[PDB]
Write a protein that binds this ligand. Sequence first.
Ligand code: K
Ligand code: K
Ligand code: K
Ligand code: K
Ligand code: K
Ligand code: K
Ligand code: K
Ligand code: K
Ligand code: K
Ligand code: K
Ligand code: MG
Ligand code: MG
Ligand code: MG
Ligand code: MG
Ligand code: MG
Ligand code: MG
Ligand code: MG
Ligand code: MG
Ligand code: MG
Ligand code: MG
Ligand code: MG
Ligand code: MG
Ligand code: MG
Ligand code: MG
Ligand code: NA
Ligand code: NA
Lengths: 272, 89
Amino acid sequence: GIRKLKPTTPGQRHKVIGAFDKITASTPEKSLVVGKKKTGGRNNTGKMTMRYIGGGHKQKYRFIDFKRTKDGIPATVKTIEYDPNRSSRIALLYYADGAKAYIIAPDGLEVGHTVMSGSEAAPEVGNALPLANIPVGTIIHNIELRPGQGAKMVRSAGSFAQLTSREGTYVVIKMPSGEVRRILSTCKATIGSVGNSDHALEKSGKAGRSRWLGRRPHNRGVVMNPVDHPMGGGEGRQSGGHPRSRKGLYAKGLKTRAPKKHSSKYIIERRK
Amino acid sequence: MYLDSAKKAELFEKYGKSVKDTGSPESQIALFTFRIAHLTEHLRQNKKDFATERSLKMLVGKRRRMLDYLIKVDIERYRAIIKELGIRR
RNA sequence: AAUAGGGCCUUGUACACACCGCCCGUCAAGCCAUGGGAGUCGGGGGUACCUGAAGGGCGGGGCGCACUAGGGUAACCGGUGACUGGGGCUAAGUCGUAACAAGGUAGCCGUACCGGAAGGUGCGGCUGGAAC
RNA sequence: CGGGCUUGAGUUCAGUGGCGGCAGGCGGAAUUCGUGGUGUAGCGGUGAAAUGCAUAGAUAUCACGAGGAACUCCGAUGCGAAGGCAGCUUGCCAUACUGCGACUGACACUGAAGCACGAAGGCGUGGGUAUCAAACAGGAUUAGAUACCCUGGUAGUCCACGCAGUAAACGAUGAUUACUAGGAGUUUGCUCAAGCUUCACAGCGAAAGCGUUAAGUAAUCCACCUGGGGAG
RNA sequence: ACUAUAGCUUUACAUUGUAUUGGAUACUAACUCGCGGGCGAGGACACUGUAUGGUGGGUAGUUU
RNA sequence: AAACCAGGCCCAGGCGACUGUUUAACAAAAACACAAGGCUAUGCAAAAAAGCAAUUUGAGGUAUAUAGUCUGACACCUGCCCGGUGCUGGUAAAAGCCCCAGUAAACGGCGCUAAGGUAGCGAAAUUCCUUGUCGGGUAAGUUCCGACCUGCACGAAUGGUGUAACGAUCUGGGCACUGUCUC
RNA sequence: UGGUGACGGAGAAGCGGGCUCCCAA
RNA sequence: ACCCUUGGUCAGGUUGAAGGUUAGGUAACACUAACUGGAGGACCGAAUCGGUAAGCGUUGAAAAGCUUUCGAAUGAACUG
Ligand SMILES: [K+]
Ligand SMILES: [K+]
Ligand SMILES: [K+]
Ligand SMILES: [K+]
Ligand SMILES: [K+]
Ligand SMILES: [K+]
Ligand SMILES: [K+]
Ligand SMILES: [K+]
Ligand SMILES: [K+]
Ligand SMILES: [K+]
Ligand SMILES: [Mg+2]
Ligand SMILES: [Mg+2]
Ligand SMILES: [Mg+2]
Ligand SMILES: [Mg+2]
Ligand SMILES: [Mg+2]
Ligand SMILES: [Mg+2]
Ligand SMILES: [Mg+2]
Ligand SMILES: [Mg+2]
Ligand SMILES: [Mg+2]
Ligand SMILES: [Mg+2]
Ligand SMILES: [Mg+2]
Ligand SMILES: [Mg+2]
Ligand SMILES: [Mg+2]
Ligand SMILES: [Mg+2]
Ligand code: NA
Ligand code: NA
C-alpha cells in the first residue's frame, strides 16, 4: 500500500510514500542491532572510488539470518519490522530454545505463524528447504548458490523466482531478471515471494529525500570541460558524441561479462 | 446465506405467532433483514457479483414495501420492529 | 476442290427519352445568412464608499432619512475589429467514381487510426443482403 | 374513516432445473521461440508474379527446454433485466417453473427526477506478450492505386484495478392485466400445463403483412412525433 | 597527424596428469572456490609467466 | 497607526516547473543540481572504481538491486531513415579482416537519395535583407503585444508545443509618488 | 549467561520529562 | 573543496495537510457539516548564513571593506 500527499507544497505535489501497514513494532530488537559507520564512497586509502554517496540519516545494522541453520527447531513470528538497510521488511523470530533471529519477511506472513527449516519442513510460506524437496512450480526467494554459504539470489522487495524443472543433481530456476539457470539440489531456498511489492510505486517528490537516503547529486558529462570528461567541451550545447564513461567505456551496447567464466555452463537462457 | 430450515424456523418462532407464521409482516421483515446482512457480507468479498447486488437491491425494496404496509396499518408495530431489528440509517 | 448472338423464366433496383441511366465528394467562380478572435467604443440596472437640494423629523443651530451628482469594481444588453473558419443557393469549370444490380471489394451502425476528394483499413454488431 | 374475504400479491415447504453470476484448481489438440539428431535445392505466395526465408546451412523431419492464447465433436437447445453466457471440476451466491389444503390479508401496477448495470473500440497505472492485426514498410495490378491481392509489422487483441457510457444496444414493436379460431413441429414438467418458431379465422393495416409470443378487443401509467435541409 | 604505450583480447609453450573408442568423451591427483574446525562443487580448463597477432587520444613524447 | 518601527500595487510577455548551487576578489543567470523518464551493462570473487600487488569501495547490498549515459515537474505528444560512423552477432611456434544481419530516447541525416521534415511552432534568446507588412497602444513607438509566412539558417527525450505556482532573472505598459528633470 | 548503560524529529501537556504523532528509523 | 566521527544553535508572528471526534446520509461503503489537530526542502521577520542594487573608498580604516538596500532563515540549514 502507498499514500499520496496532497499538493500543499511544490515539493509535496508528486510525493508518494508507503503506508507502513504491515509493520507491527516501532523499535528494533536490541541484541540484534549495532551502530553503522558510513563510507562516503571512500576505500581504505581514503580516496573516493564510488561517487554520489554521502550524508543521509544515521542508521543501525540489523543482523539478518541468511543461512537458516537451526533445522527442525520451529520458530514463531513475533513482529514485522522496518529495516533501513534494505527495501523489504524483516520479521523477528523467537525459537523454542530462546534464540532470536531476523529474516526477510515474505508476502503473506503474519504475526503468530510458525516457520521451520530443513528437509522435514513443509513447503509453506516462510519455511526454508533444500531445493531437492521443493515441489516443482512453486514460488521461492532467498536462494543459495553454494550449500551453506547463505542466501544470495532473490532478496529485494517483491522479487521472486520459480523452480520449473529438476534435472538430476540440479534444478532449473527462472530468475527475476528472466535468466534461466541451474542450481544445485543441495542449496536452500525459502518458499514465497518477498513482501512489500509496492516499493517500486514510491516517488520521492523532492531532492531532499534523496539527500536523506544518502545520495549526492550527479553531474552529466556534457556540461564538463574536456579535461574532466571525454564527452565534455564545446561552446553552447553539444551532444558529446558516442556516450561513454570517464575512462572511455562505451555505454550503449558493449557487453562486460567475462567471456570465459565457468558459470556459463550452468546458464540455459540469458536475459540481462 | 446459510438460509437453513432451522434458521428460518427459529426466525419465524422469534418473530410472529408460533412457528407456522411464515408469511406475515414483522417476520418477512426479519427474514429480509437477515438475507440483506448476509448478502452485504458476501458482496464485501465478491465486488463483481452484480447479480447478487441487484438481488440485494430488490430485497431492500421488498422490505421497504412491507414497512410501508405497516405504516398504512398502524405505527406501534412499525416502531417496535424498527427498534428491535435496527433499520433507520 | 479441303475441312469441323436471340428468345422463355426466376430475381434486385435510388433507372422511367428508361445504364449512352441516376447520383457522391474535393478544388477554382459568383451571391446570401450565421460563427471565432489582440483590441477598441457604447447603453441599462446592481453592491459598497464620499459628498449631498427642497421638504419634513427628532435636538436658532446640531444630528438624522433619500432625489441627485462623483469615483471604482463587478454584471447583463449592445456595436466595431488585423486575421481566421461552417452553411445555403446559383453556375457548373476541374478531378476521380463512393452509393443504387452480387454497382463490379455486399451494404449499413458504433469506434479508432490514416488519406487531394468521395473514402480505406482494423474490432464488434445488424440484414434494411446476395448467393448458396 | 372503521372492520371483513381470498381469487391478486407475497412468505414457507416439496419436486424439477439451467452455455445465470463470482472465485479457486485441472486439462489435450494446434501453434511460437531456444537448444540439439537426419538431410539438402528449394520454400512461401499468386489469376500470373515479385517483395521475403535459405549452402557462414532452409522447407521438411525426430527429440528436449521455456512460454501465451483459444476451447473441435456434442451443437440446435437453454439461461439472463438488458448488454450477454459454451473445455472439465469444486466452492459460494442468485434465480426460475410446477404444485401444498401451510401462512398474511389488497400489502397491487406504472413511474418524471435519481441510482445501478451496460458489446466492440478507446484512456490511465502495473503485469504479460503466442496468433491475428489499424498506423507504418516493401512487392504486384492499373492512366493513376493514398485500396482490393502478397510479404513484414507497432499499438491493440490477454490479466488486475480504475475511467468512459456509445451501437442496425433491433423483434427497427415499452411495462402490466383480462379475453378471442384452427393446422405443422420442438423442450421440460405429466392425455394436461408451461415455454420455444412458421402457415394461418375473425379482426386490424396504405400495403408488405400481424394474427393467443397480435400489429385483434379493452383498461392504467411512462417515453416520444408534428414537412425536408440548416442540424444533433 | 607521427611514433610509442598501460589496459583488454587471440594462440603456442610452462604450470600439466591418466584412460577409452585421432579430437571428443570420461577420470582425479596438479590448480581454483565454498562449508566446518575432513566434506562439498569444479578441474587439466580457469589463473599466472614468456612469446606472438589484433585493439588501444585511456596515457605520453613530438611534428604540423 | 501619533515619535522609532512598519508590504507600493496592477496589466502583459521571454526563459527556467518549483526550494536549492556557482566563477573566495568585475558574471547569481536562461548556467549546475533537482524530483521524474528512457536506453545500456551487471546472476554475485556481480558489472564498475582505486591500487604493482595484497586489499578496499560497490555492499555485506542481490535485478522493485547496483553502475554508465542522455533528457529534466506536469499535460498532449514524440514522425521518416541502419545508406555513413560506432556497437551487438554469425603471427608466434587462431583473433582479426571480409561478407551478411540487427540497432537511431546510439552519434548522425531528413536535397537523386538510406530517407526527402509528421504533429506542433515560426522576423523567434533562431530572420541576413530589416525599422519585413497589417492591426493595438502614444501627439509622435527601430522596443512591446496580436496576426501574416520567400523559415538567409525551427522542429519533436543535444526533446516539440503549452502550462497554475514560484524568481534579488530578462522585457513592455499603467496608477501612486516624487529635486530624476524644467532649474 | 541475560538486562542497564543506550541515544531521532516536530508538537500538546506537566508651586501645592513521561506522552502523542511521523518517517528519513 | 568534499567526506568521516562526535557535539551545539535557530526571538516572535501567520497559514492550516494527514488524521480524530460528533451530526446527517448508505444495504455497507461512499459522500456533506462543525470542532479538533498541527504537517510542510510553507509564509512574514530578529540572531545567523549569504552577497542583489546603489552610494562611498581606490598611496583605503581594509592585499576585497563600509553604509543603505536585498535573499534564505526546520532545512539539500548553519556551526565547534
Ligand atoms: K544531472
Ligand atoms: K580526452
Ligand atoms: K461504384
Ligand atoms: K464495393
Ligand atoms: K446486438
Ligand atoms: K402470414
Ligand atoms: K521577445
Ligand atoms: K529544455
Ligand atoms: K526521433
Ligand atoms: K559566526
Ligand atoms: Mg562550462
Ligand atoms: Mg550552438
Ligand atoms: Mg483548381
Ligand atoms: Mg597528445
Ligand atoms: Mg624534449
Ligand atoms: Mg530556476
Ligand atoms: Mg532561489
Ligand atoms: Mg566574482
Ligand atoms: Mg555578484
Ligand atoms: Mg538539459
Ligand atoms: Mg523604451
Ligand atoms: Mg521556508
Ligand atoms: Mg539579518
Ligand atoms: Mg524570511
Ligand atoms: Na552537426
Ligand atoms: Na515608485
